Amino acid sequence: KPLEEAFDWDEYPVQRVTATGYTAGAESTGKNPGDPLYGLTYSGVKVKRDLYSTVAADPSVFPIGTILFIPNYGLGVVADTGSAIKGNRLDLYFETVKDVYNEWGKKTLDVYVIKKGTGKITEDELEKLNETKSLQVFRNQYKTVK
Amino acid sequence: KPLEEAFDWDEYPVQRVTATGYTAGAESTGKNPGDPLYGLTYSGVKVKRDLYSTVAADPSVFPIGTILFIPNYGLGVVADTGSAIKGNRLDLYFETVKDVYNEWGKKTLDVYVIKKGTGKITEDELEKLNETKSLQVFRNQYKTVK
Ligand SMILES: CC(=O)N[C@@H]1[C@@H](O)[C@H](O)[C@@H](CO)O[C@H]1O
Ligand SMILES: CC(=O)N[C@@H]1[C@@H](O)[C@H](O)[C@@H](CO)O[C@H]1O
Ligand SMILES: C[C@@H](O)CO[C@@H](C)CO[C@@H](C)CO
């Protein structure tokens, strides 16, 4: 039986947060494996994924040592910080980048099938779709470059 | 308007899928910058985040060239494949790992505050938490090692 179902968690105080995953790797921490500080959180404990996992928070909201229950992740102990983790934000530790993508990022949803493909697509065809005139009004919401 | 609001998308066929994000990088693709095929999808087109972005699918479900609308991502053209991308699965291209974490992975949710911290946590404390006797029954769901 899941821990989510094993207690009446709504008896505890609740905080709405925005949560992402992170790993010890350089994408997240700037550190490389081989650095003696690799895996070391702000609190001084090493990152861990277990029954109680290390998470990052803003210590002004959740002090270091705070225990949280995060549905679909598990029990967390606030052990780390981050420059983007301010306010009602959490970063949940996962061992690998793929684990973040798969265990936190995977979402079931409906998508709409606009046109079935033929089995091939060219650069020119992709460019022409991107230049669709009637849709240019929407486009700057999707490009990364200003 | 958001594109999500601009058209009656429910007039199109719909498919329920499970979707994740990916990048061109090695964690997703096994390739590194400098590799001849770096940034190139199965179809041969370069990865792209734009009005119409390149996505990965199982060609048995969505042939290459299929146009999709994916809420909270955008229009997609099926251009890529992947080893785990089987059945009703999509992988959505993002330029960077952080963009996957932040633009696909970020979830707003309620978390439960079990115990406010004191400002410190030690390895021994974390170990004690993880050894909690009454919670051992749940613990194997959170460890990666069998
Ligand atoms: C696991 C890890 O390296 N965590 C680091 C932590 O050491 C540092 O104090 C904090 C500063 O914001 O940035 C985190 O990414
Ligand atoms: C952008 C990118 O490199 N995509 C690759 C693609 O080249 C390869 O054909 C396919 C095999 O499943 O794996 C994808 O990750
Ligand atoms: C953007 C990143 O995926 C790098 O892309 C490789 C294919 C280099 O792109 C070509 C357009 C260089 O002429």
Author numbering:
A (entry chain A), B (entry chain B): 72 to 217
Reproduce text from the manuscript describing this model:
However, a dormant state in Firmicutes can be recapitulated in the laboratory. The overall fold of each domain of the symmetric dimer consists of a mixed direction six stranded double psi beta barrel surround by five helices. In all the structures, the final two helices and the last strand of the beta barrel of each half are supplied by the other chain in the dimer.
The NAG in + NAG superimposes with the −2 position in the chitohexose in MltA. The interaction of the conserved D297 (MltA)/D151 (YuiC) with the N of the N-acetyl group of the NAG at the −2 position is conserved. The two ligand bound structures have good electron density for all residues, and superimpose very well with a RMSD 0.40 Å over 289 CA atoms of the dimer or 0.23 Å over 145 CA atoms of the pseudo monomer (formed by chain A 72–176 and chain B 177–216). MltA superimposes on the YuiC (+NAG) structure with an RMSD of 2.07 Å over 102 of the 146 modelled residues (72–217) in the pseudo monomer. Taking just the residues 166–178 from the two chains of + NAG using PISA 316 Å2 is buried between the two helices and surrounding linkers with no additional hydrogen bonds or salt bridges definitely formed in the dimer compared to two separate monomers. The +2 sugar in the MltA superposition clashes with the third (domain swap) helix backbone. This would prevent the sugar chain being longer than +1 and so the dimer could only remove a terminal NAG (ie be an exo glycosidase).
